[PDB]
Nucleic acid binder design. Sequence first.
DNA 1: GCGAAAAATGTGAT
DNA 2: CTAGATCACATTTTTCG
DNA 3: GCGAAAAATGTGAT
DNA 4: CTAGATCACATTTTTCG
Lengths: 201, 198
Amino acid sequence: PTLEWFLSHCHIHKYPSKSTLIHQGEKAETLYYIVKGSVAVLIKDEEGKEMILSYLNQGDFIGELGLFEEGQERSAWVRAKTACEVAEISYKKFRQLIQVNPDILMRLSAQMARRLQVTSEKVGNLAFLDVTGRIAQTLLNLAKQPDAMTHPDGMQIKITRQEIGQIVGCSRFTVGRILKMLEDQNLISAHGKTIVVYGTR
Amino acid sequence: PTLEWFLSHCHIHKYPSKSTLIHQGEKAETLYYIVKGSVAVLIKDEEGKEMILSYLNQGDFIGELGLFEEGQERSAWVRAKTACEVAEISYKKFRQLIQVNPDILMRLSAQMARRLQVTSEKVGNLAFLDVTGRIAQTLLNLAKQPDAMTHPDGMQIKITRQEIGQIVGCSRFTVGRILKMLEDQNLISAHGKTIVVY
DNA sequence: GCGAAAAATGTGAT
DNA sequence: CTAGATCACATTTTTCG
DNA sequence: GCGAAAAATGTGAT
DNA sequence: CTAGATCACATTTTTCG
Ligand SMILES: Nc1ncnc2c1ncn2[C@@H]1O[C@@H]2COP(=O)(O)O[C@H]2[C@H]1O
Ligand SMILES: Nc1ncnc2c1ncn2[C@@H]1O[C@@H]2COP(=O)(O)O[C@H]2[C@H]1O
């Protein structure tokens, strides 16, 4: 579409697993674009604990936040969850594709619109729903987005308790017991893969 | 220029000191613009308590997140914080607007970006910081927004314990003593009008 | 600028 | 009053060559 | 079908 | 091991007409 026009002005790079693509801080001047692969977008505290503040996937743009204002620091980290093919353009160039065909600035904005929405829920269920709650709708969203083996009938994602814990913002230790005694209610399953939607005990 | 152009095309309405300007649950119709005043995006707890996610003042944008797909159920209530003068246009009558001019595709999108930046922060401060902490940062932010009135020392900011508890996410009892602690440590005063000696 | 009616809020032990 | 954190060390899963 | 390093777990009383 | 929360009606500070 239009997106193959913008995509052609873009050096196509592969990254390894666990590479960093962006650090919080770094000069913001390149607007990326995931061609293949998935990506976790974090933030971290000077003391150390981090948070997962979204996943992103094919056709998701990255580094979008700089572009509207000049010279600002990258707002979060992003580390390839797995091997990605990411493209890239300078902002100085991007804004040109824009004033040469304005549909891509549509493509882009709708991205951060769903994003402003999903994020405002995330604030909402940190001030409201306790761990068990926060944990619950999480495994839920973790099947409306790819890796959910319909164990035959019913999801089976893999994500480690430590990870869930890093989505929710609760100790790895709490994410153990709650997830555990969550199968007590016959609602869940275990090992590393969580087979959601049914469960057992 | 656009902010006076599109401003021509729109339709100015006054809303009093408290009208519930937009409502969650609902349907993405008009795209609004604060011609005068400020606003209080607040979402709602399971049943009951609000949490302010933002304020948006003179010249910010409301209900844009409707714009780029369709049938989108409105995202959070937006209640005026005072007599703010909303100048409404139209989604349908925005797209047309948007191709005789990309400049305001831009500005709306710039606001969109600024907001996901500070929203990302909230998600960070709620999980990376203790309550007194969120209370300290907040008074810092509010003293750094327009209604704040410069004072001989610091910035004062007419607000109330119930509302910091809100914005923060903690019992108004707990906003109660923290404010009296930092009171004693000279970092802040109160009387409804808390002066942030900072 | 006014005061009645309305909204803010603080005690602590668990 | 009550949920969630924190602690060490061995225990398990899980990795991949 | 491999098999020990590695990364992930669970105690449990406070 | 501890961080906030909490539930009443007296006094205070704030509203709007
Ligand atoms: N709230 C968010 N949700 C998801 N992704 C985000 C969020 N905030 C930032 N990002 C992404 O992570 C990137 C980190 O640096 P940037 O500010 O360029 O761009 C950011 C976005 O692309
Ligand atoms: N996180 C946020 N920060 C600021 N404003 C927001 C946020 N979430 C929603 N809004 C505003 O509140 C409105 C809710 O419904 P809309 O989707 O019409 O458009 C929304 C935004 O303009």
